[PDB]
Amino acid sequence: GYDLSNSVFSPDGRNFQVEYAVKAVENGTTSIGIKCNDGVVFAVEKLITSKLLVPQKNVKIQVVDRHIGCVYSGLIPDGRHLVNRGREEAASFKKLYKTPIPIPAFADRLGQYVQAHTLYNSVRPFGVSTIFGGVDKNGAHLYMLEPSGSYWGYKGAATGKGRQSAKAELEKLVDHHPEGLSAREAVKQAAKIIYLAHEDNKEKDFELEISWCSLSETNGLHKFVKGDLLQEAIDFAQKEIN
Amino acid sequence: EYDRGVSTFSPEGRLFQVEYSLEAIKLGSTAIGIATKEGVVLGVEKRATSPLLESDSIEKIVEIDRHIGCAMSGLTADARSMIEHARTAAVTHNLYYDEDINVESLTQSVCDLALRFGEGASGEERLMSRPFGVALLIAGHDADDGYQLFHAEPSGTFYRYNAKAIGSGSEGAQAELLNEWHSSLTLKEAELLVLKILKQVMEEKLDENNAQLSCITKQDGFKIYDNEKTAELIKELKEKEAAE
Amino acid sequence: TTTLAFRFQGGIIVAVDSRATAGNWVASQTVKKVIEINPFLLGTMAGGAADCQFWETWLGSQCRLHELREKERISVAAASKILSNLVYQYKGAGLSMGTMICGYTRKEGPTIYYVDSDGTRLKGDIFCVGSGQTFAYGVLDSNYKWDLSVEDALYLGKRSILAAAHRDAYSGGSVNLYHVTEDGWIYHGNHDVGELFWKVKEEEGSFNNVIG
Amino acid sequence: SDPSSINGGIVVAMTGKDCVAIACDLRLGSQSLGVSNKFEKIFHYGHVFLGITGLATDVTTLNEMFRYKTNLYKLKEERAIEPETFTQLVSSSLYERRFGPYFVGPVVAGINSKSGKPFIAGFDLIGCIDEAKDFIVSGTASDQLFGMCESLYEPNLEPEDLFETISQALLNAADRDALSGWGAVVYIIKKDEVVKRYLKMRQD
Amino acid sequence: YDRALSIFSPDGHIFQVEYALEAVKRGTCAVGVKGKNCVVLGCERRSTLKLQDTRITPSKVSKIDSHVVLSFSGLNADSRILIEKARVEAQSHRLTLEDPVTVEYLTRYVAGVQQRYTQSGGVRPFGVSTLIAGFDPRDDEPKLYQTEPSGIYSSWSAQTIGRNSKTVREFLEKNYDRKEPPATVEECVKLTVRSLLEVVQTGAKNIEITVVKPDSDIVALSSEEINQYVTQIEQE
Amino acid sequence: MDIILGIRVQDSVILASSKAVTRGISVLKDSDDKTRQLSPHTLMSFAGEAGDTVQFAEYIQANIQLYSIREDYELSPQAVSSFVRQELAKSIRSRRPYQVNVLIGGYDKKKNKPELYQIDYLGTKVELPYGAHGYSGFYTFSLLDHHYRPDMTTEEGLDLLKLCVQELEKRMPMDFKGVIVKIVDKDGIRQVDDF
Amino acid sequence: QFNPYGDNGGTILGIAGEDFAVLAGDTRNITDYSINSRYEPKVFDCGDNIVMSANGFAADGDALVKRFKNSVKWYHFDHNDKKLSINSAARNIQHLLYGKRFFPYYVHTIIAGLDEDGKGAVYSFDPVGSYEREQCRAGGAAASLIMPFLDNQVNFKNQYEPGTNGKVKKPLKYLSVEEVIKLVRDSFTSATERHIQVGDGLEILIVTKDGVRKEFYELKRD
Amino acid sequence: TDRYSFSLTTFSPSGKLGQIDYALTAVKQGVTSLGIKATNGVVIATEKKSSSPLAMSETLSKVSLLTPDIGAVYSGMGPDYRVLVDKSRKVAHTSYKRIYGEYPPTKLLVSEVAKIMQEATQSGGVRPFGVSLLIAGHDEFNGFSLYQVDPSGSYFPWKATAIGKGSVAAKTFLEKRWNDELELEDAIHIALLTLKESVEGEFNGDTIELAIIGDENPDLLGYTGIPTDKGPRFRKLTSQEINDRLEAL
Amino acid sequence: GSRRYDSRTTIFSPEGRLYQVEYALESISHAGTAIGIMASDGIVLAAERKVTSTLLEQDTSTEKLYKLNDKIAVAVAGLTADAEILINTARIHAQNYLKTYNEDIPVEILVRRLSDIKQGYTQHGGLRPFGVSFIYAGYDDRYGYQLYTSNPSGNYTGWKAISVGANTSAAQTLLQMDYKDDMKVDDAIELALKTLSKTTDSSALTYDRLEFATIRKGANDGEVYQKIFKPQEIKDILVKTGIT
């Protein structure tokens, strides 16, 4: 009763099926997003379940337009399908208005779609939380999109198993910096709080991936972090937790 | 349960209605088939039940085209859809290329029709709710690999066989095929082999108004043998049971 | 272009030319205008080269499809009226059609039908269709007989195409002869118009306006 | 040519007092050829009378079209249709084919049965309500009729002064036109009885 | 719509076909006998109730051609859909192919409707089992077919469908030779009446006979004509 | 335009049609029926614009027979002509106008009176006691209006038809190579070998 | 106003052999009196011993080749590695042509190769559909300069045995691949001089079952 | 997919359609409404009730105009009346003011709205509007008429009727009070009196909504100068006017 | 769930019978008696309303008799609501046939048409059938007066006298004992009323609860004139039969 679909509704004012789908995201990989003054630094845990895997070749990071990074947790196919839909939407905006789509605008369009599948019985609710943001002319933005189809602005966000660990540290990071911090320094902090959020994932070993969109380094374009810069971040985090 | 949906998986790991399709071949009047390199013979039972049946106009032998023959066994409500589709497919090939269609390619096309269960799966149009309930023994000759015999399932899967027997008596037939198939058979020795395996799974007197033989030969085309020829072959089998 | 077919007692002789042009200039001298619809049916190419061939290939597809479904060979009446309706659709969309479907059977005999682009279905024992049909008619119908030998019928087919080649600019090439019988069509080879002319001039005494 | 003036046909109608009258010619032809002298253009649904001119096939298709509609109305309200509601209906149905338009001129003539008021209306090809209380004429020699009916008439005729003027007006227009005349029929329409009277006219 | 109604059964069956065949049991009873020069289709009418006109009640054998008739067993509502559909096929076959319908063409057609509605989700097959008989043009050979609400068809020399078709079929086995149909028109009509006199009875008020003979000859024989054959059977 | 004459007499209808086939500037056939039974007591002859005529006659034949067999009753000539009028009216609007001129002659059994109709390609049904189409009709109408008496017999109408054809041969520059003559009477549809 | 067809000239020649076939063509592309390109063969190998050139209006001709080589792929995939015939090739091209027959193409298409008898086979197509088997057929703009000459040296048309004076025709010959290369080169060199849509290069393709050879010869620049 | 195209109405095994019985229950949870047809007018009346005392009931309408001479009033659910009255207005204009160029007859309109109900019992993703409407009107062809529209999708003409949860009480009150000949003034006095026994709120003209389809008004027509044309037969009475009639009981 | 809430009511039951069709016949026994009697000079249709009240206006009520065309009217027994949709489809179809053939629709065709719509609801869409039963009075010149009942399955049965609705069995026994094949419209008017008096749904039969209509060939020139009596003209005939 009251989960047989999503046009059932309970006398509790809850939809159960949709709350259940948040539990799929709780079974995902840890992913964080730090809203910086001049950008956003995303980082995502990529588990090494075998030495059979090929490192930094399976991206959970797909770019939309050119300046919006999208990274997610939960059911990996469902989130890649969500981002495929939103890449079509990004193109349409660029077509009609001859400008890259803003971050608040991109959020609204994704939110309607995920919101639609929790009303129809012909299409299955989502089981993804996506953390996405970037830099446009209206500033840096960071958004977290629930599978229920909710989003807000954030000074810090997380999802996945280790969302507890990430969030607690972001409180302290907002107490370190009561306006925020540079994108450059947040490379070292995105790694740091992934490495603390791997204490619910220290059964395994992982490959650290970091991506960023920042005005001050990449000129507000979404690019990947890697090379010497990535290894500096890894060394930072390694020393912090030891 | 899991048969109330159209694509709904069951703990099994495979479709339940599809199993029921395999158990609808076991309601068909046995169709037996022996392939050799001298031509391929298809026989079939008809099933008299009355002296009021007209049986020499009823047959489970079907012509798909000049160079491809077919025998069907199972639910024949389903087989009407599939045979008409086979007939179009062959003619389309000859329209498009002015060329003979391979036995393998023709069979593969009919398997594509067989996979049309669902009403909301993929993009391709669903013209059914469920699977079919009939298997085919599409025999033929193409000029690439010579004579061929394929057995097509209502699943949407096909295997090349050298001999296959479908229908109700399929297991009892298939036991005889293992011991009686060899590569040094002839066209006529194959033809007597059909009737031997058919006689055991026949529930009546084996005669020529409840059995039909057909060949596919390169140089004669597809010929459906007349009941005179069937009657002769039947009698000579009893002479080779007068040798034991 | 000249295609003709005529009934008699023996069945149908189909006789056609092989010159096809493109503009004033002669594209080909070996373009067959007979489309074997199947082993018991012949069709002739006249009208659009494209349209006629395509649709008589498709007619043979539909012929096989009748034959498997009923288990009996198609009626010739049935063949002609299948083709007609479809062209009538492309009536007001511009297709070009003229074929004579020729067949001989066991339940109506030899029958010729003329199918048009407008969608006509005409019965007749004679048709000549093409750009040199007026010269085919003259000589053919003066020597026509329902009582006719098969040997004689082949010579009359030759002679009608040979007349058309003489006068018409687009006609000529070679002659292909077929005798459709009940058992199906038999092919009697290809005979060059260019060698036919001088032989017949000697033999019959005809073409005495031409110098020689 | 114009597919309205290819078969001609003409309708005259005049008001009186406690009467209306509509009349037509029987000539129906195709182009130059006269086809029939056995074709009436006046039809009636209840106490409304419909005359229709112009293109032949549209004369007959609209005759059965208005019959389709008035049957529905009659069964529904269980009363006769009024001249005024019929006008509105005619105007709307002509405007349905705005593109690929109808090629006729329907003429509405009746007597309002709730006041006793004579009532006429005209329509054109795309159809618009054309009120008057003197005469409404439509067709091809409508032009001719417009002069002729103006000249003869003086307001609110008697039923038989009405018949004498209306008979003239048609015959002289109708033999003054190639695709009209060939006989004539006149309905004199009172509140209670309708007399249908043929006119002997010269065969043209 | 697409919600399945034809669902696969654990017998290797379809639920809607098994029900259709129960419907043919509730139906009327049509009998078919092929002679050496005739087909005879006799059928049960339901009119046991008094004060019922029989001029205007739909007939249970309806003519689709000039020598091909369509008769039925099962529901009275659903039978009419195949009948109206068969007439459109008849006029289409004459337009595009020329020559009256053969029995065989119509046998395939009627099966294609039942078969199409069996396989698809959204349509159920009609609960109507049919006998198609008649002649083909330029053939004095009687053709007798049966189609069933599966979409399967099979030839017969004689047949019966509908209620207690088992009982009637057993009586017709002994009074019918495959090799030797009734060579007389009269004995063929008397054979179909006897079969009807098992289940149908009611004098002759539920008994109908339509005889079709070659040369485009369909004749309908009323209650009055049928009595004549009954008394001969009683004496016999 | 191919010959198509109608003459309604007072116990039958007599229809006649041209045997000649002309496509282009060449006669292809000089003996070919151009008439088809619609009903066992209604006949339709057709002429007009090549190849439209052929198709639409077999189309209408199918339509009327569909109703006639379904209900086991044959439609009156009046009803049949109205149906044909309906399609034609519709067809000129349609993508391809159909140019088909038909005389539908039938013996009404309902009212037990012959009826003859002239239907143009526009789609206007008119009852007449005689009819025609094409240019040929231009010459015959004055003859028919001269010799028609309202108490006609079948043989007087055959004799009048012979006159119409002789006049046609003189004044029309086209050969129609004789006519086929058919009678639609209460006894069926029959052919006469008089021309 | 827009006319979506044009002309880009060029010329082709396909000759059926007895165990070979040659399809040759020019590498000059033009539009009226302007030379578009000096080198750009229109004569493509399509694989599996079939060569196709669709010559004339280039845009249409290219489209036909793209789709045809797609059909080569789909023939191996969906007919289970069946080797493409010349026969099967011909009819398939005819469907791509009759399709846009009401929005006409404007190429003259020729295929060449060997049929499964092991002899040369050439089929040539009109611009909407229909094709017929020929021995020699030219196409393109210079087609009618090249055609009668090829017939005289291949089919021995209007040639007679010496001193019989038109009584005994000089029979059909035996062709070899070498011989025909000589005829092709001679004819196109004349064509360059007497026609302006021909020149710059000549690429003769030879097809056997021993492989396909591409051989380039220069022509004049005029 | 979305395979809802199967009806959500189904026959019950002792007869009768279960879904519309359920909707008829929804009519008896709604307000009360009534109509008395006079011989020189019609009066219709209903009770107003609010979700908050801070809600205005001077902006609350439960009597709506379909066409100028024809009014409607509901009992049942608010939401179900709100969409359906818009559809009643719509079908008067699409099918009789775009075809017959005038406002439809009262008989005619009532029939068309029952078709709309009838397809809300057919097919999935719909269920019938759970209201009964009284459609009082005047047309020039059937006179005054008073109708009751059922959630069945049936209609009946009446002489005086009631709907709502207090309908049975109201029609028994009206049984003695109806006569062959009535005055409109007397009709109003009966209407307010009948509704006094079925209203548990105030009985002031603030909370009693009163409307007449009495005699026509050509000064509310919005133009003048065609005598021939007639104005609204409807006239909603504002709150003060309703109070004057309460003293005149 | 877009199949979890579907119950399947377009399916047969194990008997071969549709659930919803069986239930519909019950819900039509709720509606009052409706009678058709075929004399020879006309058809009498007489129906007693299924609702009555004294503040109900019954002098303009149409709830049983409706004209489909000028020679064909129906009596309704079932829901008014359900019947209305079919009544307007009927009007369109009858007039469509008049529009194209310029001839009024025979009774047979129209009856068959409405029946197809009822069967169509059970054939597909998952739709319920409209539970209506009509008693058709119709004239055509080919069978004269024709009388029919159609049921909510979509089937039609010819009759001489027939009743649907409340007290269907009782009404029928009265018709059987009293009917002559030589009855006039007068005889049938008196028989109809007396039958309604024993199958009455109050304790008294009253003119204002009766709709009564005839179709009479008495009307000159061979025309058939349908007259739907006013309750004040039904009163006159209620005094004839002496109920009052």
CSV table of C-alpha atoms in Angstrom, one decimal, chain B residues 62-66 84 87-88 91 95 98 224, chain C residues 54 57-58 60-62 64-65 67-69 71:
chain,number,residue,atom,x,y,z
B,62,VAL,CA,4.5,-25.2,-46.7
B,63,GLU,CA,6.3,-23.5,-49.6
B,64,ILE,CA,8.2,-20.3,-48.6
B,65,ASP,CA,9.7,-20.2,-52.0
B,66,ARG,CA,11.1,-22.3,-54.9
B,84,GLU,CA,3.1,-15.3,-44.3
B,87,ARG,CA,6.8,-15.6,-47.9
B,88,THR,CA,7.2,-11.8,-48.0
B,91,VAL,CA,10.1,-12.3,-52.3
B,95,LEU,CA,12.9,-8.0,-55.5
B,98,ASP,CA,17.3,-10.7,-58.3
B,224,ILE,CA,5.7,-32.0,-52.5
C,54,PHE,CA,10.5,-1.5,-62.0
C,57,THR,CA,9.7,-6.8,-61.5
C,58,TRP,CA,7.4,-5.9,-58.6
C,60,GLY,CA,6.4,-10.8,-60.5
C,61,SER,CA,7.0,-10.5,-56.8
C,62,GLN,CA,3.2,-10.2,-56.4
C,64,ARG,CA,4.8,-15.4,-56.7
C,65,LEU,CA,2.8,-14.2,-53.8
C,67,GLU,CA,0.9,-18.5,-56.4
C,68,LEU,CA,2.1,-19.5,-53.0
C,69,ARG,CA,-1.1,-18.3,-51.3
C,71,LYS,CA,-1.4,-22.8,-54.7
